[PDB]
């Protein structure tokens, strides 16, 4: 809860610092089974209202089983593709082998949770979240078969529809999502059962505690593959995550265009660092999550995902401190479009105000407390509640921290605009410097010949 921030005027960016990490590095495929029943043809005549409702519910149950059987049968372009349910697909193909469901059915016999070891060496954690065969057979089938379908009380039909609604909703979710459901809803895996699964995974106690304190971020980060209906059981695979990296320093970097503030519409040049997003620290190197929406955020912990990341050294933090350092090529992009905007940060709001746009920083009790001039500036969230740039009113976050301000000269006041390469999206500072030199080399060769 020690979140801070640091605006760097020299490059028009702001780095929050007081964060932690829970980086998803692997998967842990469970197996969730449901004991189905075999609906033997209800040979009974008589259409009382209770019998008719029981029949309608049984028909919805058979239809769910049938539908399930038919269901079975700035720098984000550098990530690299990866199958997300590859582990669940593999486990489904393994459970499709002959015998693997027989062993699962014999492990979850007296208990409601076991740890079965599949034939290919992997140890999976099976679980039996629902038992509908028991209710259906023992309660319903005698009343339907012996007494020629004469039901006494009306509580049994409500009981049956309550028990069946969860299977019907799992069927609906699978039917709509094409048999792969994310996030794992409360019908697939309830909260008590999710915590019972977390308390038995092969992980340290710190990871169990973290995953038990943020079960919503664990639902938002897993999948529920639909696997098999065979030997009178319904089984789907829940592809839970596991965070091997925990409690390390992460820092978000908010960038914004730093343009020259000349009067006209021409003769101006912009500049923008592209490496914006959540950085973290896992093992001797810096992870980089370029989208900043691949990472969920909690009170102080960033739940990132190493599938959508890039591994870099600590000279990224070096770029954060100083940008002309020789041990890293900081990534910038150029332009010529002086457009006014504002990047709402965590404990502040960057405000770039170019051209003839009218930008302000307004409180709520007093009113407009500041009037930004040409150039990108930054106000904290102590005496500010909204930020108005042009016709777009931006609100500011009321998180509590120690915002700073690091004064410096805008680096774009060093490039002569006559040679500034003004069209880039994956440039850097050494690349731009090489472009500028070759340009100056061309100029000197033209004027000395």
């Amino acid at each position, epitope marked *: 809860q020690n979140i801070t921030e640091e605006f760097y005027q020299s490059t028009c960016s702001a780095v929050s610092k007081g964060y932690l990490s829970a980086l998803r590095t692997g998967w842990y495929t469970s197996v969730i089974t449901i004991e189905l029943s*075999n609906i033997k043809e209800n040979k009974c005549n008589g259409t009382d209202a209770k019998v008719k409702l029981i029949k309608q519910e049984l028909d919805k149950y058979k239809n769910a089983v049938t539908e399930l059987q038919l269901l079975m049968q700035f720098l984000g372009f550098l990530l690299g593709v990866g199958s997300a349910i590859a582990s669940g697909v593999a486990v489904c193909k393994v459970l499709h082998l002959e015998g693997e469901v027989n*062993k699962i059915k014999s492990a979850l016999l007296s208990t409601n949770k076991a740890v079965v070891s599949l034939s290919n060496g992997v140890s999976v954690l099976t679980f039996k979240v629902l038992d509908l065969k028991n209710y259906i057979d023992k309660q319903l089938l005698p009343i339907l078969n012996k007494q020629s379908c004469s039901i006494s009380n009306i509580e049994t039909v409500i009981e049956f529809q309550q028990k069946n609604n969860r299977l019907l909703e799992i069927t609906r979710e699978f039917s709509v999502n094409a048999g792969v459901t994310t996030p794992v809803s409360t019908y697939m895996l309830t909260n008590s059962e999710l915590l019972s699964l977390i308390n038995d995974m092969p992980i340290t106690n710190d990871q169990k505690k973290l995953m038990s304190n943020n079960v919503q971020i664990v639902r938002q980060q897993s999948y529920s593959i639909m696997c098999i209906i065979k030997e009178e059981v319904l089984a789907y695979v829940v592809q839970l995550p596991l965070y091997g990296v925990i409690d390390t320093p992460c820092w978000k970097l908010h960038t914004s265009p730093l343009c020259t503030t000349n009067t006209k519409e021409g003769s101006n040049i912009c500049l923008t660092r592209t490496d914006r997003g959540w950085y973290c620290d896992n093992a001797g190197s810096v992870s980089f999550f370029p989208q900043a929406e691949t990472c969920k955020v909690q009170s102080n912990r960033v739940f990132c995902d190493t599938m959508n990341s890039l591994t870099l050294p600590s000279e990224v933090n070096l770029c954060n401190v100083d940008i002309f350092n020789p041990k890293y090529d900081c990534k910038i992009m150029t332009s010529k479009t002086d457009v006014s905007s504002s990047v709402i940060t965590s404990l502040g709001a960057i405000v770039s105000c170019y051209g003839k746009t009218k930008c302000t920083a307004s409180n709520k009790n007093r009113g407009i407390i500041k009037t930004f001039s040409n150039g990108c500036d930054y106000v904290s969230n102590k005496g500010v509640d909204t930020v108005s740039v042009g016709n777009t009113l931006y609100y500011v976050n009321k998180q509590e921290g120690k915002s700073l301000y690091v004064k410096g000269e805008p680096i774009i006041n060093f490039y002569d605009p006559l040679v500034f390469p003004s069209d880039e999206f994956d440039a850097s500072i050494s690349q731009v410097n090489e472009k500028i030199n070759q340009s100056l080399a061309f100029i000197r060769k033209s004027d000395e010949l």
Partner: antibody
């Protein structure tokens, strides 16, 4: 209430062809693939293979490859075996079984003796 | 090709003793085992669903134990019914194999 009724006894000659059938009532026949297990006089029990009750695709144990052939009729809810080129060693008791929770479920045997 | 072997290939007991049969697996069949018993010309009826959890319908004197590579069926008391041949089979992976068979007769 799960039943697997099997064919009756038989007597053949070496070099003939025989077809043993196994009827399966008490459950949805298309759920469990049916397994075939051979016994022998004095020897131990031998599991020979299974046949999926959806596609019919059979698979055989290395000791029972080449002549034994599995087949079924999904509509009739029954599966049968065929032992081509009977030999004096093919004599014994042949069992049809399916997966119970842990163990198998055996139907009564068919003593198939091959004498001359 | 996990091959299993039973130690008491023969056996003989009284009508009140507690006898124990063992099976040794040639591989790590973690927990999956079962014990059939064949009467005088019947089909092998199973006694346990697993190494430990016995099967419903049988008397409580049968008590299985073991894991991995060493299992033990124990008949806690003999009666005229508890006489036949006792096999043991793994159902961990294919192909399935049986024990040599344990013939139990009167003392």
């Amino acid at each position: 209430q799960i039943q697997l009724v099997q064919s009756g006894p038989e007597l053949k000659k070496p070099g003939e062809t025989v077809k043993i059938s196994c009827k399966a009532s008490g459950y949805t026949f298309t759920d469990y693939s049916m397994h075939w297990l051979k016994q022998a006089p004095g020897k131990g029990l031998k599991w020979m293979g299974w046949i999926t009750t959806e596609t019919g695709e059979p698979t055989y144990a290395d000791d029972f490859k080449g002549r034994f052939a599995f087949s079924l009729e999904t509509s009739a809810s029954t599966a049968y075996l065929q032992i081509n080129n009977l030999k004096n060693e093919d004599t014994g008791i042949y069992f049809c079984a399916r997966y119970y929770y842990g163990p198998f479920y055996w139907g009564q045997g068919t003593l198939v003796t091959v004498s001359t | 090709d996990i091959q299993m072997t039973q130690s008491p290939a023969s056996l003989s007991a009284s009508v009140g003793e507690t006898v124990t049969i063992t099976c040794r697996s040639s591989g790590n069949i973690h927990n999956f085992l079962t014990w059939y018993q064949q009467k005088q010309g019947k089909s092998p009826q199973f006694l346990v669903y697993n190494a430990k959890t016995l099967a419903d319908g049988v008397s409580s004197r049968f008590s299985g134990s073991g894991s991995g590579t060493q299992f033990s069926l124990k008949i806690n008391s003999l009666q005229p019914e508890d006489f036949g041949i006792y096999y043991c089979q793994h159902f961990w992976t294919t192909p399935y194999t049986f024990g040599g068979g344990t013939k139990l007769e009167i003392k």
